[PDB]
Design a protein around this motif. Structure first.
Motif, short mmCIF file in Angstrom:
data_model
loop_
_atom_site.label_atom_id
_atom_site.label_comp_id
_atom_site.label_asym_id
_atom_site.label_seq_id
_atom_site.Cartn_x
_atom_site.Cartn_y
_atom_site.Cartn_z
N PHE A 113 0.81 -1.22 0.00
CA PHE A 113 0.00 0.00 0.00
C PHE A 113 0.84 1.27 0.00
O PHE A 113 0.26 2.35 -0.10
CB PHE A 113 -0.94 0.01 1.22
N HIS A 114 2.17 1.16 0.06
CA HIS A 114 2.96 2.37 0.22
C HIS A 114 3.05 3.19 -1.07
O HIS A 114 3.16 4.42 -1.02
CB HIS A 114 4.37 2.02 0.70
N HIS A 115 3.06 2.53 -2.23
CA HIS A 115 3.26 3.23 -3.50
C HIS A 115 2.99 2.23 -4.62
O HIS A 115 2.79 1.03 -4.37
CB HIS A 115 4.69 3.78 -3.65
N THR A 127 5.04 6.03 -7.64
CA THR A 127 4.38 7.16 -7.00
C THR A 127 5.15 7.56 -5.74
O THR A 127 5.82 6.74 -5.09
CB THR A 127 2.93 6.84 -6.64
N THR A 128 4.99 8.83 -5.38
CA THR A 128 5.44 9.33 -4.09
C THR A 128 4.34 10.22 -3.57
O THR A 128 3.41 10.60 -4.31
CB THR A 128 6.77 10.12 -4.16
N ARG A 129 4.43 10.54 -2.27
CA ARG A 129 3.56 11.51 -1.62
C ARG A 129 4.43 12.66 -1.16
O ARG A 129 5.58 12.46 -0.83
CB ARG A 129 2.86 10.87 -0.42
N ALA A 130 3.86 13.87 -1.12
CA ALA A 130 4.56 15.02 -0.54
C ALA A 130 3.51 15.84 0.19
O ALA A 130 3.13 16.94 -0.24
CB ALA A 130 5.27 15.82 -1.63
BR LIG Z 1 6.86 8.80 -0.43
#
Ligand SMILES: [Br-]
Ligand SMILES: *[C@@H]1O[C@H](CO[C@@H]2O[C@@H](C)[C@@H](O)[C@@H](O)[C@@H]2O)[C@@H](O[C@@H]2O[C@H](CO)[C@@H](O[C@@H]3O[C@H](CO[C@H]4O[C@H](CO)[C@@H](O)[C@H](O)[C@@H]4O[C@@H]4O[C@H](CO)[C@@H](O)[C@H](O)[C@H]4NC(C)=O)[C@@H](O)[C@H](O)[C@@H]3O)[C@H](O)[C@H]2NC(C)=O)[C@H](O)[C@H]1NC(C)=O
Ligand SMILES: *[C@@H]1O[C@H](CO)[C@@H](O)[C@H](O)[C@H]1NC(C)=O
Ligand code: CUO
Ligand SMILES: [Br-]
Length: 393
Positions: A113-115, A127-130
């Motif tokens: 579920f992280h990416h 994908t990444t999150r910011a």
């Molecule tokens: Br991330």
């Protein structure tokens, strides 16, 4: 369990492991359906056509958005079930106050579920999150969550197409503020569905739709149909109508008008209590809000081929300004063009009251628009808001 969407905070360790095992198999591409195949229905690679132009298939900025995303979210949930998941897609109720993302999705190691991987790129391009700071800190410093108050105004609406504008624009904030400046992530239409948090968000978004349908049933109003955009809701929810969709239930019920009945797709929620309120108690709270005199800003929104955050201030005639609110638009270069056919409403009652301003006082409402890559945009991209006064009922 089977087909039951649980609040993410109630999952057992066994359920968590089982969901992770199922997602790992879907992402591996060795199973019945692949993560790419499903995620590709949303944005990149464009799977739909608008004449000769290739466009994303996901339906945004229109009355079919809730039904399109209801069917899409079920498609992924079925893929997980086919790879052994024993529960449905859990929902994260982000209208409760929270200080960090759920551990189901935030754990970095051994966590599907992280990416997600970006098709066409090397395996280490993901994908990444910011995350943006207002995801965790109420930008209005109000009572309860910023998202809770926005959701209540959506739930107040008594007509599907009025509901839908409030609903969809609220849902955009989570995309914008999870993804932030990430090149591949939740804040662009093209890549959002490659981040597995997309489906935790859209399980909650679908549950909000289900809650509004319960409210409509309790009110004696339309909940399994709508009497607006009647032909639009009968169009195919591409690509789910196509013969290469291996999922019978989404292929045969692939119109937004069919999607009002979610039971027929094979899933349900653990419950539909919004913040532990029964439906009658929720509607009672909504009716109480309607007893007060309120001031609203009204925005006409359209696709601008990118995602952006809009912020506005309320400035008195002496030049004293206070933050007055914010919302987001989700989009990108692959979007199907769109213009809402009605205003997006935004409650500014409290900030008018605190500044001792009436709707007919002297003041200005400066607008700022910033793309999610951080670039300031021309505020004139959007029509300036209008001001309404709604006397209490
Ligand atoms: Br991330
Ligand atoms: C993230 O992963 C990427 C991708 O790496 C790939 O996957 C991993 C798992 C391994 O299998 C890699 O072997 C594999 O490439 C990593 O980026 C790679 O990093 C390595 C090490 O720095 C680079 O090695 C260098 O390779 C060049 C040759 O690159 C040419 O050939 C590659 C195939 O071997 C192609 O992928 C390239 O696109 C490139 O193709 C060239 O195209 C030109 C056209 O102008 C022509 O000359 C030829 O067609 C061809 N040229 C050739 C074959 O000479 C080599 O010269 C150099 O000496 C190194 O060996 C990889 O090139 C690089 N791949 C890519 C796509 O960038 C990242 O390092 C990882 N990042 C992190 C943070 O982990
Ligand atoms: C607004 O300002 C004008 C002068 O610029 C003044 O004549 C008018 O009374 C003001 N209106 C209010 C509601 O204060
Ligand atoms: O994804 Cu298409 O909008 Cu939330
Ligand atoms: Br229509």
């Amino acid at each position: 369990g089977v087909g039951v969407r649980k609040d993410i905070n109630t999952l057992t360790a066994a359920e968590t492991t089982n969901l992770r095992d199922a997602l790992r198999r879907v992402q591996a591409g060795t199973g019945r359906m692949t993560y790419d195949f499903i995620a590709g229905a949303h944005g990149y690679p464009a799977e739909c056509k608008m004449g000769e132009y290739d466009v994303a298939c996901c339906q945004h900025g229109m009355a079919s958005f809730p039904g399109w995303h209801r069917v899409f979210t079920r498609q992924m949930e079925i893929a997980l079930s086919w790879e052994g998941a024993k529960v449905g897609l859990p929902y994260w109720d982000w209208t409760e106050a929270f200080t960090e993302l759920p551990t189901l999705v935030s754990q970095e190691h051994d966590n599907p579920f992280h990416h997600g991987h970006i098709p066409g790129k090397a395996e280490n391009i993901t994908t990444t999150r910011a995350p943006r700071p207002q995801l965790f800190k109420d930008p209005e410093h109000g009572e309860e969550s910023f998202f809770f108050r926005q959701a209540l105004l959506a739930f107040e609406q008594r007509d599907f197409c009025d509901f839908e504008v409030q609903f969809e624009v609220l849902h955009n904030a989570l995309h914008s503020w999870i993804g932030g400046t990430s090149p591949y992530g939740m804040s662009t239409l093209e890549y959002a569905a490659y981040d597995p948090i997309f489906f935790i968000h859209h399980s909650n978004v679908d549950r909000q739709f289900a809650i509004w349908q319960e409210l409509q049933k309790h009110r004696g109003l339309d909940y399994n149909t709508a009497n607006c955009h009647i032909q639009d809701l009968r169009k195919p929810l591409e690509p789910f109508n196509r013969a290469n969709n291996p999922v019978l239930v989404t292929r045969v019920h692939s119109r937004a008008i069919d999607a009002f009945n979610y039971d027929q797709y094979g899933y349900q929620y653990d419950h539909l209590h919004f913040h532990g309120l029964t439906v009658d108690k929720l509607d009672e709270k909504l009716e109480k809000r309607k007893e007060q005199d309120r001031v609203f800003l009204n925005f006409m929104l359209r696709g601008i081929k990118m995602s952006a955050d809009v912020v506005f201030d309320l400035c008195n005639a002496q030049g004293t300004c206070n933050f007055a609110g914010t919302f987001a638009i989700l989009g990108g270069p692959l979007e199907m063009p769109w213009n809402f056919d009605r205003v997006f409403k935004y409650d500014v009652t409290k900030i008018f009251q605190q500044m001792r301003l009436r709707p007919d006082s002297n003041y200005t409402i400066p607008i700022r628009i910033r793309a999610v890559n951080g670039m300031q945009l021309d505020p004139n991209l959007l029509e300036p808001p209008s001001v309404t006064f709604v006397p209490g009922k």
